[PDB]
Symmetry: D2
Subunit: 251 residues, 4 copies
């Protein structure tokens, strides 16, 4: 209870699935939250579903949009005061091997999953440093930041990039006494409405050769590790990877 | 608040430092706790310092003592009901390179840091499986489960062993639907009375070439990640390493 | 001797330092080699310094140039027959933290270090698969694919990306029986003329807190691991990272 | 050719499978070799099958036998001159989960796979340091030093231990300018007569969910990476893990 007292969080891709659960638990624990999505039609509904405007609001933004990042931080600060917490959660996937990835697919995926995370991390450091906020940047990787998948080539590239970029940022922030921590979270497979819409997907993900627990996770599994990382409870954790994957990478 | 509702935890080496902080936060979050130490004279004091006998008790036990493990589980169950949570935290160190480690030092360290963790893990699985407890075994490694230290040869061996043994156990428990998770926690350097008694130690540990944050942690840093891992919040986390090290292993 | 009998290799950035040593040892071991560089003025000199045109030639190419990749493979095949071996070695660095990286710096570095490696890997798979060549793609990471450096933010992103992308490609090639292996090589610090031109650099790199051996490597250190990976000696190695770093990442 | 000119190597468990292939290629590359096994009846045959007594000899030794280690080094030095190279390859397996491992099984496996490797590493450092030999200690892990197997609990413990202990030793040797390198080799599944005798084993190991290449390796796959690590070609490689696993750990 009140584990995020006084925190102000931006969560990209916060209107659905993992991002929405993070937003929900953040609000429950006392944080003010701005959620984003590229779209407008889902965001206001999603915010109101979690709480009132004094707790959580929506801001339309594509995380690949560099200039939109300043606007997002400015809107969040206007609503709630200085931002203390950034969850870079927006991402997309291309279901292609490296061999079969078009250059357009490559650039599109990297724009969201890599450039977007860089834009957010860079701006977050600049805006959150040296303010006594207990600032925390949580960058969403996945199991595909550790292991390959033959049909997620560009996705693997992006997750490996975010995994190690985050360490660079963590180190610089620590060495410069910025009061900003940077860590990555690595979900395995998580059940969402989007997964439910893909016939056979949950079953395939739940095979023991994929997920040893024999079932997949749920959005709150990722929410709870994010609460820990946003909270001052994790004030000595930086530059590290936090894996919640049902055993996927343990075998 | 009440994040460990109904849990019953054993914490080896729970009378000091990290173990004591884990015990303290476990009690605060609603767990019943049995702490151990090889000795008798510190344990009762330490338990009473945290709470009353209905919350926390002491049991004298050397974790290298195989038969004493059954006795410890039996005493905890008698006091509090079936054990749901085991933190294998008892450990020792030998300040020797591999080259300069005597065989007696080798066997002594492995008896506590490796055999003891095996005895606890094996018995914990047997006692906690198939009971709907949301059981969790938390095995204490350190940064020395990831990286070498030229003057901690046997210690490195033990921490590497626990790191990967824990994955084996996690997988078997998951595949067999035992309702037991197994994970490791990897502290960097943590300030304790024992560190305070070693002249120059905290300062050396706090150099940026060691800990990028420029200071060391505190016992509660390790307590909070243990609460998360004991709690049902981490029900999809198994077979993974949770690092809280001020950036030590990020560079 | 003759460890690369019949092999035909492309080495990007093969006119200097590590790339040139790889080229030299490849020729010594019986491979035909095409080396590249963005420039023209160094390449012909460098090739002739290693061997005759029937052994090694130069092709001007910037690895960020997608269309130039087809041209490079076509020129190499014309000179030497079908390409069996690709070493993606071309890379640049920006000496900036994530916080201080401009977007132009970000895109420039990723164009060479990430896009270029993707273009080469994708085309290499397409051109080398299913031909009985014992094909091998060797992607040059560095220690900065494993650990952060606070002043190499974009570089870290690129090396983490290549590390995990390479695993995706390795897996797809293995599962599809393509007869293409993909692995990464991770040099620590290596002495070259460019390092010699930077006052204090080798000394800083040689401090024990950086490189435990107390000195840095030399280009042939990286050449020899590349010979092993190009050779049929490594026919069961794929999807793996080969580190030659004087102990840098071991502590 | 002559890649191990002048080297003198001890290979534990060198009479069969991987160890025998290492011995064979070592002799081919100009090293003198002493192979061991607990038994006498296989060793002399195995040595003669590789070469003459001036190239390779046998010494009966159980690697768990501490005092026998001095005797082994003394016999090798008598035959061939000072030892430059140690391959700790002797190992056993227990096919049990952590839960089902008896204490006797635990101690037996650790005696060979952990104590034996420690005894060899410790003595090797003492005997090989400061002699200008280009000394190299190669410690045999496996994929089970990286990932768990639910039915190889004690084995996982041993391989994780050797993985990180080896880093400690590498660092101490590097920092003290001992001219000794220490690295680990991590085979996936390898076809041997022992595997052939286990019905269904190779087929199970060759499933794509285990080995992405769809087949297992052969002893020479491990021999060739050992040649590289024993050779002065790898003079800047220390404290690192060299994986040859058909993609097993890449997914
Ligand atoms: Mg390090
Ligand atoms: Mg795996």
């Amino acid at each position: 209870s009140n584990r995020l007292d006084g925190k102000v969080a931006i969560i990209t891709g916060g209107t659905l699935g993992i991002g929405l659960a993070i937003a929900t638990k953040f609000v429950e624990e006392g944080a003010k939250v701005m959620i984003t999505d590229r779209h407008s039609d889902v965001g206001e509904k999603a915010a109101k579903s979690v709480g009132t405007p004094d707790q959580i609001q929506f801001f339309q933004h594509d995380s690949s949009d560099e200039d939109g990042w300043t606007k997002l931080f400015d809107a969040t600060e206007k609503a709630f005061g200085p931002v203390s917490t950034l969850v870079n959660n927006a991402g997309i996937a291309v279901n292609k091997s490296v061999e079969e990835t078009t250059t357009a697919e490559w650039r599109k995926l990297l724009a969201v999953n890599l450039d977007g995370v860089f834009f957010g991390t860079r701006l977050g450091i600049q805006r959150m440093k040296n303010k006594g906020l207990g600032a925390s940047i949580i960058n969403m990787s996945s199991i595909e930041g550790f292991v390959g998948d033959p049909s997620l080539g560009a996705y693997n590239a992006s997750k490996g990039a975010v995994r190690i970029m985050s360490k660079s940022a963590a180190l610089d922030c620590a060495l410069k006494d910025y009061d900003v921590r940077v860590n990555t979270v690595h979900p395995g497979y998580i059940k969402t409405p989007l997964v439910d819409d893909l016939p056979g997907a949950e079953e395939a993900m739940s095979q023991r050769t994929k997920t040893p627990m024999g079932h997949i996770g749920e959005p709150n599994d990722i929410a709870y590790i994010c609460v820990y990382l946003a909270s001052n409870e994790s004030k000595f954790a930086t530059g590290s990877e936090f894996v919640v994957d049902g055993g996927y990478t343990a075998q």
